[PDB]
Amino acid sequence: ELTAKPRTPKQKLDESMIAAVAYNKENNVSFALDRKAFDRAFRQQSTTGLFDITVEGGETFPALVKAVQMDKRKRAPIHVDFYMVTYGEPVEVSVPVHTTGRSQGEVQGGLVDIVVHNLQIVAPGPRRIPQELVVDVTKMNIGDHITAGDIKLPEGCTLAADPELTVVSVLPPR
Amino acid sequence: MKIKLVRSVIGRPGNQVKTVQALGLRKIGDSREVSDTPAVRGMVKTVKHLLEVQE
Amino acid sequence: RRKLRTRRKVRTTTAASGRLRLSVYRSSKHIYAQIIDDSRGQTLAAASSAALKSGNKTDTAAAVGKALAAAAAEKGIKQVVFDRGSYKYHGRVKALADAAREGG
Amino acid sequence: KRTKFRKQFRGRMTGDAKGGDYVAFGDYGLIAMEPAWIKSNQIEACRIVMSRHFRRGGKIYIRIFPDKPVTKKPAETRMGKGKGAVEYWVSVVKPGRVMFEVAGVTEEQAKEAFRLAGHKLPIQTKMVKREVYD
Amino acid sequence: NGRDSNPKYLGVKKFGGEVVKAGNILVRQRGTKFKAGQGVGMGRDHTLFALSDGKVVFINKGKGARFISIEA
RNA sequence: GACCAUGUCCUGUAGAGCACUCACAAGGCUAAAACCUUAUGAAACUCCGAAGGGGCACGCGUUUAGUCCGGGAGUGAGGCUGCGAGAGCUAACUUCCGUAGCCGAGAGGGAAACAACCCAGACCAUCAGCUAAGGUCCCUAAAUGAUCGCUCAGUGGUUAAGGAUGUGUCGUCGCAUAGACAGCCAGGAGGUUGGCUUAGAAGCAGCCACCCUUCAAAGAGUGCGUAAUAGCUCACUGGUCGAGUGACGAUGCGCCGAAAAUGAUCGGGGCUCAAGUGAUCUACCGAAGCUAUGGAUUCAACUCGGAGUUGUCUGGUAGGGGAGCGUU
RNA sequence: CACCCCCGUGCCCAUAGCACUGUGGAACCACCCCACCCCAUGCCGAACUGGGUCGUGAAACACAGCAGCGCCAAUGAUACUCGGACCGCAGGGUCCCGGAAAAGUCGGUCAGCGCGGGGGUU
Ligand SMILES: [Mg+2]
Ligand SMILES: [Mg+2]
Ligand SMILES: [Mg+2]
Ligand SMILES: [Mg+2]
Ligand SMILES: [Mg+2]
Ligand SMILES: [Mg+2]
Ligand SMILES: [Mg+2]
Ligand SMILES: [Mg+2]
Ligand SMILES: [Mg+2]
Ligand SMILES: [Mg+2]
Ligand SMILES: [Mg+2]
Ligand SMILES: [Mg+2]
Ligand SMILES: [Mg+2]
Ligand SMILES: [Mg+2]
Ligand SMILES: [Mg+2]
Ligand SMILES: [Mg+2]
Ligand SMILES: [Mg+2]
Ligand SMILES: [Mg+2]
Ligand SMILES: [Mg+2]
Ligand SMILES: [Mg+2]
Ligand SMILES: [Mg+2]
Ligand SMILES: [Mg+2]
Ligand SMILES: [Mg+2]
Ligand SMILES: [Mg+2]
Ligand SMILES: [Mg+2]
Ligand SMILES: [Mg+2]
Ligand SMILES: [Mg+2]
Ligand SMILES: [Mg+2]
Ligand SMILES: [Mg+2]
Ligand SMILES: [Mg+2]
Ligand SMILES: [Mg+2]
Ligand SMILES: [Mg+2]
Ligand SMILES: [Mg+2]
Ligand SMILES: [Mg+2]
Ligand SMILES: [Mg+2]
Ligand SMILES: [Mg+2]
Ligand SMILES: [Mg+2]
Ligand SMILES: [Mg+2]
Known part of the structure; x- marks a missing residue:
């Protein structure tokens, strides 16, 4: 090594x-x-x-x-x-964001932008931290933005960013 | 410390010229012993590219 | 705000003159009025009103001044600078100066 | 590209870039290899061509901008009097500073988009994909 | 344009570690870029000159809090 | 004095940053100024901020200049290069400043030639020696030197954007003795003469959208085709086939790109059967630099009533000083 | 500097400040207390100010907890640069030696030292 x-x-x-x-x-x-x-x-x-x-x-x-x-x-x-x-929830790590499937705006709308490709959070587990963060964008309409507030945080994770911040957002074409 | 000029002072910025002069080699092919004192050791580091430092 | 005291205590630049300064605290009539040589972090002549009585505050103040004048004259002091606090030279403190330099 | 109000004139120099060496916003991007000024018009041509390749698209950030006036002297005049008045605006572009940054378009599509967007440019450039980013 | 104005060779005329006669000028300044410590007195244009003969010393926590004293 | 070292103080450049000012990039928020996440430039922006640089003091260390006072001057047109700026077109053997060095005032070797570049400051004499830069195939002094390569272009011995199965050196991605890449035969399908279009648009003008059957086996599917279908091919399938291939990449040396005027050329010959090249190592050539012997001046100490010794110095324009030779 | 605590006044000169907050009570301080007059408000006893107990620790202030904020802040690595020495026609850039930030991370702190006095364990 x-x-x-x-x-x-x-x-x-x-x-x-x-x-x-x-x-x-x-x-x-x-x-x-x-x-x-x-x-x-x-x-x-x-x-x-x-x-x-x-x-x-x-x-x-x-x-x-x-x-x-x-x-x-x-x-x-x-x-x-x-x-x-040092173990025992000490970790302040930036988890990558990821997006699943077809969105309702990916059907008939246009762009599907991740405004925050990565986002920081504390991890209750030190040696176990998410390797990604798949986001269920299927249900949003065109011109809506998934805010960080409703971003799944497995196993008691805290969110180290603003609840009202936009993360992904569908965007109109052109 | 052993010192010998093996570079001309011509065409070299004048601090290096008064430096070699106070070192007391007025012509290339001169040599001298020198004190270990930091003042003169730095006097020689200043124009080491002109000299062959031996010790 | 009470920018009276930082102003008046920046105006004792004449602690560079060598004279000592005479702080006063017309608060609860506690008017303790210390004398200080600033160069050392040292005070030299206290006159707190612990049980002096003497009645109304304007005259107990003059009593504090007349007692401190002795309390400092024992040690050998005479140059004076009256570093007033935020307070005016309005009387209840002015009596302190009158009685203090009445018997330096 | 033109700057809506300013102070009037400038000057110039170069050393390597300290602002925007890493990509954000987009999926892929493009980076300078050579220090240079770039005119408003070279930007606008990259926009025109990459909007040609991105119909109904909208994934075109322009993370550069002509800040600096540059003022040629008039017709045929002997020297004497000021720098005339500004003839065009330019952006300093030191190496390693990204210019361009797309999203939403497959690798070979963005790659062709960057081929044309670079060919109108006066500099070497390189396409980059993002992963060593804090 | 093509206008300009005479140099005003302002400065720290006397640097800390310089003995000074009384009335020597030690700092020139537009204002109170220096604020004059013990022994020094500041003039009309805010140049500050020593009053007492001796060494010059800089009190200098900075940010407008730099003072010039003289030690005898 | 001067350089150099220590100590100390002062500075707002490079850089770097947005905390104020101008500017400016994508969004969220909202009667948009404001505000937040993210993102940037700044000679007249600065939360910051070196390297260096200047003053003092010491000399804890080598050196020899300095200061003032009196006589005489000349000079007050600068030139280049490198670094840092302005002006210019990031033109100029351009113009204007800072700074270092050379030239002016400078000889000698190198750069074919050449004030400025690289080496090196000419006291005199020698048919003496070591070297600097630069060199060692012949011109032309000195290894047709040695070892691992690199380029077959005369590149070497005139640029670039851009292209290239050129060639070495690493290096990232796939599918193979359950047998792949080209390569030969074999099949090409199904509603479907598919929706959306102009007058017909039916793999195969073209804006919008790609799921479903029958299959060891085929994408409503590539470029061609008349204006439309057929038609020969293709992406998966196969007997054979017999072992590697294909992809973007970093790079080292090269190709193209690459037209001007009297006759061509790297200074010439000629050079790959290195005289090119990158890496190492020597051995010698090579100056008016240094060393040897002899010799004389300038200064200074040291001795005797300019002399002699030891050290040292001696390129030179305007100029200042000094010793002397010639004519009436 | 026997131990704490209070009023003041310094050195320091945001690692000490903000906010959240809890303790404090007639000991100290603080509001409330009254105003023809000392004295004053370019109107108001709010501010100075003069005459005092109750009342109350409400507010302010003092003192503790506190790492949400601010404040500081490495190492390391760069940027840059003094000298040396180079390449590119050019914008520009490289190498050797040595000095070397800024931003960020790691991490640090809700301070630290006096002087006089007042009242406590009586
Ligand atoms: Mg500059
Ligand atoms: Mg930045
Ligand atoms: Mg003008
Ligand atoms: Mg000296
Ligand atoms: Mg800058
Ligand atoms: Mg300077
Ligand atoms: Mg001394
Ligand atoms: Mg004279
Ligand atoms: Mg002139
Ligand atoms: Mg000049
Ligand atoms: Mg210009
Ligand atoms: Mg010229
Ligand atoms: Mg001229
Ligand atoms: Mg001349
Ligand atoms: Mg000369
Ligand atoms: Mg010459
Ligand atoms: Mg030549
Ligand atoms: Mg010649
Ligand atoms: Mg000539
Ligand atoms: Mg000549
Ligand atoms: Mg010339
Ligand atoms: Mg050379
Ligand atoms: Mg030789
Ligand atoms: Mg040699
Ligand atoms: Mg020969
Ligand atoms: Mg090329
Ligand atoms: Mg050979
Ligand atoms: Mg030899
Ligand atoms: Mg010779
Ligand atoms: Mg000679
Ligand atoms: Mg002789
Ligand atoms: Mg001479
Ligand atoms: Mg000579
Ligand atoms: Mg002569
Ligand atoms: Mg470090
Ligand atoms: Mg060095
Ligand atoms: Mg340098
Ligand atoms: Mg370094």
Whole structure:
């Protein structure tokens, strides 16, 4: 897995997706990653899950990806931030939104826009967080907007955004 | 510390020129021992691209 | 608001003059009126009205001034600056100054 | 594209973009490869062509905008007197700054939309799909 | 246009760590960009000059709360 | 003095941000100003904010200049390059400022040639040595040097948007010894001469919509077809077939794109059977730079009543100073 | 600085402030209390102000809880840049060395130190 690269060591042209710190109250950790092998996992997990790492010394450490620092000039990653999981509803995570089926406005109307492609919520379960949030858009009429207030939140989840905020909304054509 | 000019002072911004002058090598191919004191160690770091630092 | 006191206590810039200042608190007639050298965080001459009696507030105030004048003269002080509180020089406090410098 | 009221004139320079390196709003998008000014009219042509490909569509955000006047000197005149009066507006577009961002159209349809929308443009560009976004 | 106005070479004429004679001018300013600490007195155009000979020291929590004292 | 180091203070640029001002992007909210989620630019915007930079003090350290006072001046037309701005068209061997260096005032080697670029500041003499930049096939001094490649274009030795089964290096996505990609035969279907259209629009002008039967097997279904159907093909099916292929991608070197005027060319020859190239490493050539021997001036110390020693210095326009030679 | 608590006045100079809030009571402070006069309102004893107990901790104020807000805020990584050295005709950009933010995350706090006095455990 990851190796220690404290301070400012040079990276391989194999990107080794460096510049990675995991932190909470306890300890800060080292950078070095394994380039594409990072990306191959990250897209699968994509902020909504955790995965362990094993630097020599510490054989395990769970973190859920707090944020990434990609290049601007060549759309590739650079630095990634992490946060450790103290368990027992401590997690403030941004769940992806998703939409199911044909909508009544997808029948005869037009556009079906997700105004918030992702949305933040606290998770009562630390190691169990939704990987998505399928939304039942079938029943809305053209010109209506599903607000966040009626967005299903499984197993006692709180909503970290405004109840009245629009999330998806059908839109007129043109 | 051993020091030797192996670059001309000509055409180089004048802080580097008074720097080599106070270092006391007035011609390329000069050398001298130098004190470890941070003042003169920084006096040599300023124009290290002109010199061969040996020690 | 009571921007009387921050104003009057910014006008004691003449604590740079070396004179001490003489705060007064025409509140419950508690008029404790401390004397302070500001440079240290130190006060030098209290005169609280704990059981002085003396009657009506305007004259008990002059009693507090005449007693504090001795209480500070013991220690060796004479330069004075009358840092009034929000209060005017209206009498019930003016008696404090009259009786205080009556017997510095 | 034209700015409804302002102060009159400007200047210029470049270094790499610090506002809008990531896409929101849309499904896919398009990004600059080259620093440049872009005129109101280059925008409007991208709008005209991508509205040609998006009939009854409405998925066309334009996350760029001509803020900067640029003022050519009149006909044939020797130098002397001000920068004439403004001839056209332009938008600074440093690399990595997204310009365009579609939704609701299948990958090859948006890809052709971006082919034509880039070909009227004075710069290299690239289509991007969104996933490394916080 | 093509108009403009003379320079007013304003500034911190004396920087903290500079001994000053009485009447030396230490800060020039349009206003109270500096607010004059102990020993200093501020003029008409709000330049503040030392009154007492000695070292110059900057009290400076900032945001309009910067003061110039002189220590003897 | 000067550079450099420490300590301290002052600054509002780069950047970066919207907290005020102008602007501005999609929505929700609503008698729309306002407001919220999301999203941005700003020389005259700033919640912020370096690097650096200036003043002081020290010298905790190397150096040699400085200050004032008196005599004489000249100069007050600048030029380029790089960085930072304005003006211009992000033109100019353009014009105007900041800043560094060169040129002016500068010789010597390199850049074919060439004030400005790269190297390097010429006291004198030598048929002596090491090097800088730059070089080592012949011109022409010096490895037809060594090792892993890269380009077969004379690219090298004149641009770009854009295109390309050109070629190496990685690299992401599918379907294969239950046998796929082209490749040969075999089938092409069903209401359906399908709704919506103009005068007929019937895979196959065209705005709106794609479900359902009979099947090992076929999408009311691709480009062609006369104005409409047939017609030869196609997407799945098959005996055969016998092993890899196809896709977008990053890139390294190249192709096209690519027309001007007397005769062509990389400085020339010629170079791939490297004299191109990217990476490494040497070995030597190569200057008026440095080293050797000899030699003389400027200054300064050091000695004897300019001399001699040691160090040091000696490119030069206007100019200032000094020692001297020639004529009546 | 024996332990708390109150009135005041400083240093500090939002990590101390806001809001939600609960305790407080004749000890301190605070409103209420009356006004021809000291004294005053460009009208009002609201404000100054002068004469006082009840009453009441309502309000204000003090003091605690409090991480919804604000306030601060790393590491890490960049941006940028001093010197060095480069490429692109150009807009522009790269490399070596060293200094290095801003925004955000992690996380921190509803403070911290004096001085005089008043009343408490009598
Ligand atoms: Mg600039
Ligand atoms: Mg931004
Ligand atoms: Mg003008
Ligand atoms: Mg000095
Ligand atoms: Mg800026
Ligand atoms: Mg400056
Ligand atoms: Mg000293
Ligand atoms: Mg003179
Ligand atoms: Mg002139
Ligand atoms: Mg000039
Ligand atoms: Mg212009
Ligand atoms: Mg010129
Ligand atoms: Mg000219
Ligand atoms: Mg001349
Ligand atoms: Mg010169
Ligand atoms: Mg030359
Ligand atoms: Mg040449
Ligand atoms: Mg030559
Ligand atoms: Mg010439
Ligand atoms: Mg010449
Ligand atoms: Mg020239
Ligand atoms: Mg060179
Ligand atoms: Mg040699
Ligand atoms: Mg060499
Ligand atoms: Mg030869
Ligand atoms: Mg090209
Ligand atoms: Mg060979
Ligand atoms: Mg050699
Ligand atoms: Mg030689
Ligand atoms: Mg010589
Ligand atoms: Mg001799
Ligand atoms: Mg000379
Ligand atoms: Mg010379
Ligand atoms: Mg001479
Ligand atoms: Mg860091
Ligand atoms: Mg450096
Ligand atoms: Mg630099
Ligand atoms: Mg750096």
